[PDB]
């Protein structure tokens, strides 16, 4: 199984540098052309460059926009692919993918899961997480909808699970909304009445950038 796992995304101020990684396994890392392609918000996929294989002398090729600013290289001992970026700017904010070309200038057969880069001068801020429970005995129909408001954080992203992922069905985590340097999202979970409040419903919220990790148990109120 070919696999590419990236690490390294995050917030960096304009003018800053940041290096992304892509751990590879499942094939001979040195016999393939290795690429990086980014996907900016609402924009088409954009190839950035590559580093060749052994036979071709490990040559690199970059696109005109990132040419000079970005460098691609392989790690000396680990099967890691890097993307060194320098003098970053707001327009570089995007989801970055490391991808393997099946041959020479052919196609991208395997992609990484993606890592995000945000280029901004706004400050890292942990989210304020609030539990959402109805203010009244709302049973009349059946099933019950609960939620959590993850408000005032920066940068993206935060991960939300319900009962440590035990609760998979009935979840709707909504895409964060940005307003004046701050993000806010919400998540809803729909559970059968028998499990709540009888059986504890908690939303686990993690915001890596700030190491924050909170679990708000939804408690009935009136």
């Amino acid at each position: 199984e070919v696999k590419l796992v990236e690490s390294g995304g995050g917030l960096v101020q304009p003018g800053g540098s940041l290096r992304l990684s892509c751990a590879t396994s499942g094939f001979t890392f040195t016999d393939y052309y290795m690429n990086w392609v980014r996907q900016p918000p609402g924009k088409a996929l954009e190839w950035l460059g590559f580093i060749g294989n052994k036979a071709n002398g490990y040559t690199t090729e970059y696109s005109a926009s990132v040419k000079g600013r970005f460098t691609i290289s392989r790690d000396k001992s680990q099967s890691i692919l890097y993307l060194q970026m320098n003098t970053l700017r707001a327009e570089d904010s995007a989801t970055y993918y490391c991808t393997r070309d099946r041959g020479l200038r052919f196609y991208f057969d395997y992609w990484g899961q993606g890592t995000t880069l945000t280029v901004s001068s706004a400050k890292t801020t942990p989210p304020s997480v609030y539990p959402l429970a109805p203010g009244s005995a709302a049973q009349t129909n059946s099933m019950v909808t609960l939620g959590c408001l993850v408000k005032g954080y920066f940068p993206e992203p935060v991960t939300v699970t319900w009962n440590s992922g035990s609760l998979s069905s009935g979840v709707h985590t909504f895409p964060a909304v940005l307003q004046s340097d701050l993000y806010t999202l919400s998540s809803s979970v729909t559970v059968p009445s028998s499990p709540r409040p009888s059986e504890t419903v908690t939303c686990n919220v993690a915001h890596p950038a700030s190491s924050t990790k909170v679990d708000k148990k939804i408690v009935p109120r009136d």
Binding site: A44, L45, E46, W47, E61, S63, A64, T95, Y97, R102, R105, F106, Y107, F108, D109, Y110, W111, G112, Q113, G114, S128, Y130, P131, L132, A133, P134, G135, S136, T145, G147, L149, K151, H172, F174, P175, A176, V177, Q179, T184, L185, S186, S188, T190, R221, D222
Partner: protein, 213 residues
């Protein structure tokens, strides 16, 4: 250079239907490769070198074309086929991708399950008051939410967010939020989250009365 142009930007299909989408090259290319991308995930190789199925890809998919015209076809659309499909060439530097074709699965109308929530006490003690309203599992995607505070509708302070089409039921979801301070929240009694949707002329209305506790 050579620019790839995909059409249509959005394609609607009912499960069972046969659909085709096209990738047009502004200049002749030798091969066009296709990728399937579901929101929150990375693109996956779908069709390569014009007509070869990537490993794991369902035989209902096929690709074809030459010169400047290429197309991807799904013989019998299935609900899991909802995704954006991208075409790509590598003729000169740099290799470029088309803008994509979003496949939208057509399903029967479904009214939203609406839930309203007064501000949490925790948030409220902090001086803020966010009223949240979930409008889940509906179809079609077009829907209007109106907020009313004691019969008076207001639009400022509302922040909306929609999800992408579900892969199993093919529905959409939305969350609307009315943001005020604790003080503004305490100058009114009734809070209503009103939803106008194709599933009915009359709006869905969910309300609560601010109950100081």
């Amino acid at each position: 250079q050579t620019v790839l142009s995909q059409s249509p930007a959005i394609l609607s299909a009912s499960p069972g239907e046969k659909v085709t989408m096209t990738c047009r090259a502004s200049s002749s290319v030798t091969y066009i490769h296709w990728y399937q991308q579901k929101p929150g995930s990375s693109p996956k190789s779908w069709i390569y070198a014009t007509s070869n199925l990537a490993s794991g890809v369902p035989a209902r998919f096929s690709g074809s074309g030459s010169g400047t015209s290429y197309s991807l076809t799904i013989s019998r659309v299935e609900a899991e086929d909802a995704a954006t499909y991208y075409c790509q060439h590598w003729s000169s530097k740099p290799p470029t991708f088309g803008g994509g074709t979003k496949l939208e699965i057509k399903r029967a109308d479904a009214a939203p399950t609406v839930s309203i929530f007064p501000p949490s006490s925790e948030q409220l003690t902090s001086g803020g008051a966010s009223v949240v309203c979930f409008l889940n599992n509906f179809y079609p995607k077009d829907i209007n939410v109106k907020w009313k505070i004691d019969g008076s509708e207001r639009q400022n302070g509302v922040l909306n967010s929609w999800t992408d089409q579900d892969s199993k039921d093919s529905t959409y979801s939305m969350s609307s939020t009315l943001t005020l301070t604790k003080d503004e929240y305490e100058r009114h009694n009734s809070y209503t989250c009103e939803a106008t949707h194709k599933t009915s002329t009359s709006p869905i209305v969910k309300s609560f009365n601010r109950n100081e506790c």
